[PDB]
Structure 1
């Protein structure tokens, strides 16, 4: 059956990637919480 995760790298990055978190106020606050929690990978880039 066709499950929910149908992967695509270009949609992974355009959607949840770094240049797209940095592109706005609230994604920069996301990166700030991931750095402050101290996190090995911030976004999902590769």
Structure 2
């Protein structure tokens, strides 16, 4: 049957992408928190 993920690149970069994170105060807090953990992947 139809599963849950169903990928779309434009939809992925537009709801979780770098510029989507940087366009809100809380999205920049997400990025700061990924950087403090040292994650090699900030944004999808």
Runs of 4+ in structure 1 over 2 Å off: none
Structure 2 unaligned residues grouped into runs of 5+: none
The number of equivalent residue pairs is 44
Normalised by the length of structure 2, the TM-score is 0.98
Normalised by the length of structure 1, the TM-score is 0.94
RMSD: 0.3
Structure 1 unaligned residues grouped into runs of 5+: none
